[PDB]
Design a protein around this nucleic acid. Sequence first.
RNA 1: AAACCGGGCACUACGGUGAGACGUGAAAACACCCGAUCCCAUUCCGACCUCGAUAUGUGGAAUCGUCUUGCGCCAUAUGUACUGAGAUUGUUCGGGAGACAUGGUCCAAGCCCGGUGA
Lengths: 84, 106, 207, 37, 29, 144
Amino acid sequence: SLGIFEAEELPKYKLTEEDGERLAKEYSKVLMREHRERRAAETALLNLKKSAIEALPENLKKAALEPDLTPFPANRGMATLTPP
Amino acid sequence: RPPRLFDYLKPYVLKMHFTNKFVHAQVIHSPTATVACSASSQEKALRETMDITRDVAAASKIGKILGERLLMKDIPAVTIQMKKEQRYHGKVKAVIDSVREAGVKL
Amino acid sequence: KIVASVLFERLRVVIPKPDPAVYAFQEFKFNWQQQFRRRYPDEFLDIAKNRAKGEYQMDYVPAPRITEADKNNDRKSLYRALDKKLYLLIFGKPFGATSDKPVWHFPEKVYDSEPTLRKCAESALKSVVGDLTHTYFVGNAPMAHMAIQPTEEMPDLPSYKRFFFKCSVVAASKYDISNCEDFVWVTKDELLEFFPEQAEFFNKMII
Amino acid sequence: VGKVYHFGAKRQMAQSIGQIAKFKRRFNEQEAEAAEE
Amino acid sequence: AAAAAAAAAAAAAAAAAAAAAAAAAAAAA
Amino acid sequence: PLNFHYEDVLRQDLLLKLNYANVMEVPGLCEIRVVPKAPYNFIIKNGKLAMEIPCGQKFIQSTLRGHGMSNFLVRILTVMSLLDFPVEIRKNSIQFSMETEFCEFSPELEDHFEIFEHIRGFNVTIITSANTQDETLLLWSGFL
RNA sequence: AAACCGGGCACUACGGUGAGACGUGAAAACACCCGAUCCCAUUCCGACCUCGAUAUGUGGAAUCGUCUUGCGCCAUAUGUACUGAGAUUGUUCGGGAGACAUGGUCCAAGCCCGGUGA
């Protein structure tokens, strides 16, 4: 019955070129800016973390060098801006 | 290796490639040491003049530059050796169209 | 030697606005794809339907980032900036008021570093809070190291290196009372209201 | 651009926080947000 | 792509592909 | 909404949680794959339409990357993992998998459910950038 | 300047090839990181290619060039197998592998282009 026209589909079209050329080039720019931003952030963090663990005695050099599973069950409700 | 020499020696092969900072291209001899023509955007005289040194603009520019440095240097024809993943669309289309409209015949 | 200086952080609860270019291109890309890469099904319409709905005539309008607790600069709650990161800092040792400022610090416990140190710092916080069950300490590794009295360690005055840990937030209401008559969260995402330029340079551990 | 697939209903969700960044297929259905426990 | 001119010659010699419905929805408005 | 969360919260979260000589190592959603059970087309037209609907881009099988991945995953993650509580596995490798077995869960669909009306093997597997089952469960624990 | 590094061409199996641990970039270079708008990508999909953007992020040891083990060939030893010409129905004269053994896994050579002080 109504599987024929739905599967075939109809290519719809209508335009506004204000809605056709808003310059994704700036978009690409600002987005690579943001990503390099957060990358520099994260990498400095990484590096001082490795430094931190380094800065401890052999007690944690053997007891804090291993990646751990205690972070694994880190459930965390995200926001709800209206309590139910 | 590529051409499997057939009847008429045809030196001066053009080949081009694209680092995502500069477009480089050469037209090289069968002695294949003395590069008969060498057109790159990395050049001294071309780092500054050419600004956007990785799009089709720098591509076609390098093509035109070369084609003239060729017609004026007396190598009025050349054979193309596209590398394995190339295809005559885009960044090599520009080199090809530019050296073909520079006067040269391929 | 060694201290353990943990801190709590409320993770922001909505998305900070990105520059208009991003949203502009996104709406545009959507409409562009709707021109070409759209071929809508059920050319009639989505005809199967029920009409009497919206039955509870109240949309989900949280009025966000601009709550009343926001317009009054209220550190003592956790309802100021719905799209900024927040941090917990309590009053330091009032002996020195570092560079003419009421010293605020982190629940740092100096100790001989007897047990597993993630445990000793998490217990530091559970002692400073009364051991209430809202917390999460990420890794057994510390955040980063900070030297204390390094120049005064040359005359051998007691030396310790704070190893920061990180915990997060899951609930709004206070996860403490106080330890030093003064608790203050951030809303400027950074620690000058709480501490001098040391943290302004340790901004390589907050983001 | 090439053209074979579609989704056109701009759908906003009804999580109590308020959910955006949802875009769906059945198109003339504009918005039918709802959530629960 | 080239299918554009392919359909050009296709409508020049023959006519009436699914471009019948295409042009139908395009000539409705 | 989701990547906006993965880039500030999650990435450096996992980064501190574990120890990688660099930062590129941390896991992350690569691709999604949906493959149903009903043998193939010509068997039910609205059946194939259903095999299309919740993904929006598919005809033969489907694989999703990019904003397709983000949008689809947030839809799934919220509908199933929050009010019907389904089952879900994660293979002791990069692979992470789950099933559908019905569709009339989500309001979007619920009115237009007339098309599904049949079970599906509907193997939907997220193949992330995971490297060890440890990190896999990290990932889909920290993704609610 | 002599020389070095990087990039392209070239030559080459001792100059290949996996494998693993390394040493790793930013000084410059190459790569990647990020999108998919028109050219391209998919018989679904920026996964691969492409187009578009990186002002100094990473070498994810992703590839990459690097450091040594270890990965085929190259070189040759003693012999035997086989065989040539011979008839003392093979007591002579030549040629001589496969496998076993050993060792090397080069000394070397250009041309352009950017850079390191020049």
